[PDB]
Structure formats: structure tokens, C-alpha cells
């Protein structure tokens, strides 16, 4: 099955969140639902490393607090 890193590859390109909110919105409808669980990890990851302008391989526990 598709893994989180794969989704993250594509989402790494998604910039300024507004585009991300759009891409996540575009995904949710048509998404596998079960796979969506893996995709959500990439959404949060990317959103995390975008809110902070740093690129993490693994998101630190410290970072999650800053998400809106």
C-alpha cells in the first residue's frame, strides 16, 4: 500500500498552505478513506514543516503545539 513518505513527496511541493488547504480538500473527496489516514500524516507533517519554514525528516513533539 501507499506509505506516508510517498504522499509527503508530492505535498512537499505544496506551498503557502492556501494551496495545501486546497490540495487536502481536493484529496479528501476521492480519497481512499483508509489510506487517507496515511495521507493525513503527510498533511500534518507538511503543515508542520511549513508553519515553521524548516524541513523535518521526523517531526519533533515540540512543534505540534504551534499548529492552529
Amino acid at each position: 500500500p501507499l506509505t506516508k513518505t510517498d504522499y509527503l513527496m508530492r505535498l512537499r511541493r505544496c506551498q503557502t498552505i492556501d494551496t495545501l488547504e486546497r490540495v487536502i480538500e481536493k484529496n479528501k473527496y476521492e480519497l481512499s478513506d483508509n489510506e487517507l489516514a496515511v495521507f493525513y500524516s503527510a498533511a500534518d507533517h507538511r503543515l508542520a514543516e511549513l508553519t515553521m519554514n524548516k524541513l523535518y525528516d521526523k517531526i519533533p513533539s515540540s512543534v505540534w503545539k504551534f499548529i492552529r
Binding site: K4, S41, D44, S61, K65
Partner: protein, 44 residues
Amino acid sequence: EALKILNNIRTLRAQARECTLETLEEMLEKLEVVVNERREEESA
């Protein structure tokens, strides 16, 4: 709301079988972050 359904240890295991371990750690880390936000808020 619908988060409350998860507070069932048997059902937690069930739904857990179909998730891989590396995701489980993320969910857990998501969660503790959330309750730590309330431990400070509510309790403190």
C-alpha cells in the same frame, strides 16, 4: 464527540491491527500533545 468512541481498550486493539506501527506512534504523539495541552489548561 466521535473521538470518545476510542476510549475502548478492546476496540482500540481492533482498529489498531490494520494500522502500521509507525503511524501508531504519530497518533500517540499527536494525542499526548493534546492532553498535555489540557493538563496545563484545565488542571493547571
